[PDB]
Subunit: 116 residues, 4 copies
């Protein structure tokens, strides 16, 4: 069961955000963002299978959601370049992480949900 999931909703259409590009980065020891995983949300607005328990280690992660491209595929030209969530992953045993995002053209909300 994946330890990292992303769900994206659309506040303008009141539906899941489908086929949104999501890029995950990890901060390396050289303090540079290194591509870690990426994918596209499904018809339910959810993106599963980003990583595995073995690959997802403690560190600083950045979740970048390409909101601008998604809005333009629906006919909207927004003003944000992307939604971004930066969080620290910690070990306690074992912790799953879900990033929930709510998108509007000029506003976004993100929540970090931690379940077992």
């Amino acid at each position: 069961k994946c330890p990292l999931m992303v769900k994206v909703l659309d506040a303008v259409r009141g539906s899941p955000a489908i086929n949104v590009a999501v890029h995950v980065f990890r901060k390396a020891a050289d303090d540079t963002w290194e591509p870690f995983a990426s994918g596209k949300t499904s018809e339910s607005g959810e993106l599963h299978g980003l990583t595995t328990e073995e690959e997802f280690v403690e560190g600083i992660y950045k979740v970048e959601i390409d909101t601008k491209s998604y809005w333009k595929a629906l006919g909207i030209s927004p003003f944000h370049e992307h939604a971004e969530v930066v969080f620290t992953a910690n070990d306690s045993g074992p912790r799953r992480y879900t990033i929930a995002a709510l998108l509007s053209p000029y506003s976004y909300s993100t929540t970090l949900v931690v379940t077992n």
Copy 2:
């Protein structure tokens, strides 16, 4: 498959809101709020089985989430009395409705998500 679901998240603890009381009301012809359904969110913060396709007809509905009692069961004394969402149900074919709520002691966000 239920046509009305409610999911509640906790922005302070970064987890689903468990055992939150949810009351659903429908506006009758006499313009009074009539109890329609109610329940409590599960360990996943979701409340399923509120109604059925046959009982859930067009109308004005009110979803009241008892945030104040939930915060006090966790040790928090908030300032909102409850989170409330009032929406119109419409027929097009057949439409499922999900109310998503994000709770803080002095703030809440609600989203109406419509899936097929």
Copy 3:
């Protein structure tokens, strides 16, 4: 200086919500909602002068924002009937209350801000 203010923003247009109708109600001893004050937001999305320090006493208050009518004056037909915030006013000395609201067609966020 008014003890109760309401500010409303538009997440779709990225601007203040102008000329939004706001109705404030107070719960009387008979447990009925009694009209207390109302007004319309200015070009800055703010509504000042709802009440006075002498009229604004402890109690349960409901702030109803007529989102549906505002969206339809801009060309949008939303799905929420209105945004509603219910809170308890308390005395400590003297406390000003500001209700901040962020509106989307299928989502809204409200925050209760308390300043001195």
Copy 4:
């Protein structure tokens, strides 16, 4: 009158977020983030005077709010590293930009408001 303002609110305490560090970056032609301006929010949670009309030119900007340090000065150890808003500034005549942020330990909301 400054063309760029940042206001930050606290959803846990229901108050303005005071003395939050804010860093603004601009994307240069070499596609690197170059420090542009920074400051700290006042008792009202607002940060004025970040830049001037002459210095604030079209481009890609990043507004980084140091949420983690602010929470720890109040006794809270959060999970986000910072709130970040990336937007494009455009010329039309003349446009002021306000970034509004609502902070919780495990959630944040940001809105881009454009006034004249």
